Design an enzyme around this catalytic site. Structure first.
Site, short mmCIF file in Angstrom:
data_model
loop_
_atom_site.label_atom_id
_atom_site.label_comp_id
_atom_site.label_asym_id
_atom_site.label_seq_id
_atom_site.Cartn_x
_atom_site.Cartn_y
_atom_site.Cartn_z
N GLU A 105 0.79 -1.22 0.00
CA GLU A 105 0.00 0.00 0.00
C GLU A 105 0.83 1.28 0.00
O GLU A 105 0.30 2.33 -0.37
CB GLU A 105 -0.95 0.04 1.21
CG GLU A 105 -1.91 -1.14 1.28
CD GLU A 105 -3.02 -1.07 0.26
OE1 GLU A 105 -3.25 0.00 -0.34
OE2 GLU A 105 -3.68 -2.12 0.05
N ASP A 162 -6.68 5.86 -4.75
CA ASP A 162 -6.25 4.48 -4.90
C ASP A 162 -6.27 4.08 -6.38
O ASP A 162 -6.54 4.89 -7.27
CB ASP A 162 -7.02 3.55 -3.97
CG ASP A 162 -8.47 3.33 -4.39
OD1 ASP A 162 -8.88 3.76 -5.49
OD2 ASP A 162 -9.21 2.69 -3.61
N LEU A 195 -9.05 3.72 2.84
CA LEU A 195 -10.10 4.31 2.03
C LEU A 195 -10.88 5.34 2.84
O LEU A 195 -11.31 5.07 3.97
CB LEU A 195 -11.06 3.22 1.55
CG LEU A 195 -12.33 3.68 0.83
CD1 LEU A 195 -12.01 4.33 -0.51
CD2 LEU A 195 -13.32 2.54 0.65
N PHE A 243 -8.30 -6.90 3.45
CA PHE A 243 -7.97 -5.48 3.57
C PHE A 243 -8.27 -4.75 2.27
O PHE A 243 -8.84 -3.65 2.28
CB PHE A 243 -6.49 -5.38 3.95
CG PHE A 243 -5.99 -3.99 4.26
CD1 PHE A 243 -5.59 -3.14 3.24
CD2 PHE A 243 -5.82 -3.57 5.57
CE1 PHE A 243 -5.06 -1.90 3.52
CE2 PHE A 243 -5.30 -2.33 5.85
CZ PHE A 243 -4.93 -1.49 4.84
N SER A 260 -12.09 -20.50 -4.85
CA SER A 260 -10.73 -20.30 -4.35
C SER A 260 -10.63 -20.71 -2.89
O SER A 260 -9.65 -21.35 -2.48
CB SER A 260 -10.35 -18.82 -4.47
OG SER A 260 -10.83 -18.21 -5.66
N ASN A 284 -6.77 -20.40 -9.82
CA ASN A 284 -8.13 -19.89 -9.69
C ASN A 284 -8.15 -18.44 -9.23
O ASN A 284 -8.96 -17.64 -9.72
CB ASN A 284 -8.91 -20.77 -8.72
CG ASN A 284 -10.37 -20.39 -8.64
OD1 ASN A 284 -10.78 -19.63 -7.76
ND2 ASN A 284 -11.17 -20.90 -9.57
#
Ligand SMILES: Oc1ccc(OCCc2ccccc2)cc1
Length: 162
Positions: free
Chosen positions: A11, A20, A32, A104, A117, A132
């Site tokens: 990040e 972002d 965010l 996250f 998955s 996948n």
């Protein structure tokens, strides 16, 4: 290596409001603020999150505190979700970091799409899970970050972050 170092790599750290990869107002270590196009709305969210009048700018300490809150919220969200918790609890510590990383980034809206998955991960079918996981908007839109996370799930090592 731990979840904080991993997400700090993925990040970055920025002390002023930024956007972002999806164009949404964000600050700090990927916090965010809002999906609204209004910068004023983002600034209100920031002041609410920090508890002072920030004018769109925070300190490193404040960014790190928000980050700790955000990591904890991801973990607690996994543990409260009856679909995610059994998979999370089946994983080793390194792969649990990869799981937190994805939550996250995408929250709970990705749970349904990643059903297969999740099954492959719980079954420890690492190569198949990796294939996948890459068949996703997530991988196509942020491929380098997704590749690091996927390699972490595939190998159970920190090799992609070293
Ligand atoms: O928004 C999302 C996107 C993907 C998700 O699943 C894959 C990662 C994972 C694996 C084990 C436990 C929790 C999460 C969940 C939510």
């Amino acid at each position: 290596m731990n979840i904080f170092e991993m997400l700090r790599i993925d990040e970055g750290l920025r002390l002023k409001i930024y956007k972002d990869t999806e164009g949404y107002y964000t600050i700090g270590i990927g916090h965010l603020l809002t999906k609204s196009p209004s910068l004023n709305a983002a600034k209100s969210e920031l002041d609410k999150a920090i508890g002072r009048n920030c004018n769109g700018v925070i300190t490193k300490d404040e960014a790190e505190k928000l980050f700790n809150q955000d990591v904890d919220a991801a973990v607690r969200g996994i543990l409260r979700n009856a679909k995610l918790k059994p998979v999370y609890d089946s994983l080793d510590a390194v792969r649990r970091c990869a799981a937190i990383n994805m939550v996250f980034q995408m929250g709970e809206t990705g749970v349904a799409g990643f059903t297969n998955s999740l099954r492959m991960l719980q079954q420890k079918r690492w190569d198949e899970a990796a294939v996948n996981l890459a068949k996703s908007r997530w991988y196509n839109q942020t491929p380098n970050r997704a590749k690091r996370v996927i390699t972490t799930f595939r190998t159970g090592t920190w090799d992609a972050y070293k």
